[PDB]
């Protein structure tokens, strides 16, 4: 197809490995590029951890308001929000917002602990029908992005279907789903990724990710004006362990898709 030819050309020009999955909810059509290859998730995994805690709050109605203590030993390599609350508390809602909208790594580790370890995050993926997602490590080592390593990976196809379920489907309760959508729409880290390749009038909710091997990811739900929403996953990784991030590649892939 024309779009797949253009994505292959983009990939060739970039020197890396690009994975794309689009779901058009108007007719449930899909566009895939390396859709079944594994990619390191890096911070895009935070969506699954937040969704898992939201699922627990359907039975534990007060769970999101529960205070969690931030201690100096909790801080890892990137904690822009948790840093502001050391020796104090943050609620699970505040931690979920920090993990999603600022990519706070301490917030992620607190969410993982609430779920009983990485196996608890993976369990939630299995419970909603995602047999591909695997979370194996905590922050920050889940970002090592070593070529061929299956740890902390998923495929574009799997993540697109799961993100659709979480945000536009009914894997979560109504209040929980609306909360997740609100969080994603309020992301602060995505301006140069998928959003940069789309018409400025479209509403986007996304979660970015980045890691070693120049790994540069973004997953997004898109609400075009007067048109059914889309789900778009873009994963990108490179051969050099010290390669720079390439958010422009994600923007260009979104632009190629939007031309459809």
108 vs 137: CA distance, rounded Å: 11
Q: How many CA atoms does the CB half-sphere of 216 hold within 13 Å?
A: 24
Torsion of CA 191, 140, 50, 194, to 10 degrees: 20
Q: Where does residue 43 rank: exposed (0-12), middle (13-18), buried (19+ CB within 10 A)?
A: buried
254 vs 51: CA distance, rounded Å: 25
Number of domains in the chain: 1
**Is 96 annotated as catalytic?**
no
> Residue 212's domain is classified under what CATH number?
3.40.710.10
153 vs 40: CA distance, rounded Å: 4
What is the three-state SS of 159-175?
A: HHHHHHHHHCCCCCCHH
122 vs 135: CA distance, rounded Å: 6
- Of 251, 125, 144, the residue nearest 190 (C-alpha): 251
Structural domain that includes position 83: 2-260
| CA-to-CA dists, residue 186 to 11, 100, 195, angstroms | 29, 9, 13
202 vs 8: CA distance, rounded Å: 26
Resolution of this structure in Å:
1.6
Q: How was this structure obtained?
A: X-ray
Is residue 229 within 8 A of residue 223, CB to CB? The reply is yes
What is the three-state SS of the chain?
A: CHHHHHHHHHHHHHCCEEEEEEEECCCCEEEEECCCCCEECHHHHHHHHHHHHHHHCCCCCCHHHCEEEECHHHCCCCCCCHHHHCCEEEEHHHHHHHHHHHCCHHHHHHHHHHCCCHHHHHHHHHHCCCCCCCCCCCCCHHHCCCCCCCCCEECHHHHHHHHHHHHCCCCCCHHHHHHHHHHHHCCCCCCCCHHHHCCCCCEEEEEEEEECCCEEEEEEEEECCCCCCEEEEEEEECCCCCCCCCHHHHHHHHHHHHCC
- Catalytic residue (one of 1, 14, 43, 45): 43
């Amino acid at each position: 197809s024309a779009v797949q030819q253009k994505l292959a050309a983009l990939e060739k020009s970039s020197g890396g490995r690009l994975g794309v999955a689009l779901i058009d909810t108007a007719d449930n059509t899909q566009v895939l590029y390396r859709g079944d290859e594994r990619f390191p998730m890096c911070s895009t995994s935070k969506v699954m951890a937040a969704a898992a805690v939201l699922k627990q709050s359907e039975t534990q109605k007060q769970l999101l308001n529960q205070p969690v203590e931030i201690k100096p030993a909790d801080l890892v390599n990137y904690n822009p929000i948790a840093e502001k609350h050391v020796n104090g508390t943050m609620t699970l809602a505040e931690l979920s917002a920090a993990a999603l909208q600022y990519s706070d790594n301490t917030a992620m580790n607190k969410l993982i602990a609430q779920l009983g370890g990485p196996g608890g995050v993976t369990a939630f993926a299995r419970a909603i029908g995602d047999e591909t997602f695997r979370l194996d490590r905590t922050e920050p080592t889940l970002n090592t992005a070593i070529p061929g390593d299956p740890r902390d990976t998923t495929t574009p196809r799997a993540m697109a279907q799961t993100l659709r379920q979480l945000t536009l489907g009914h894997a979560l309760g109504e209040t929980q789903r609306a909360q997740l959508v609100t969080w994603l729409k309020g992301n602060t880290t995505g301006a140069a990724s998928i959003r940069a390749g789309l018409p400025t009038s479209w509403t986007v909710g996304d979660k970015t990710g980045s890691g070693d091997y120049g790994t540069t990811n973004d997953i997004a739900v898109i609400w075009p004006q007067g048109r059914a929403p889309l789900v778009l996953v873009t994963y990108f990784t490179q051969p050099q362990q010290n390669a720079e991030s390439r958010r422009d590649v994600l923007a260009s892939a979104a632009r190629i898709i939007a031309e459809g």
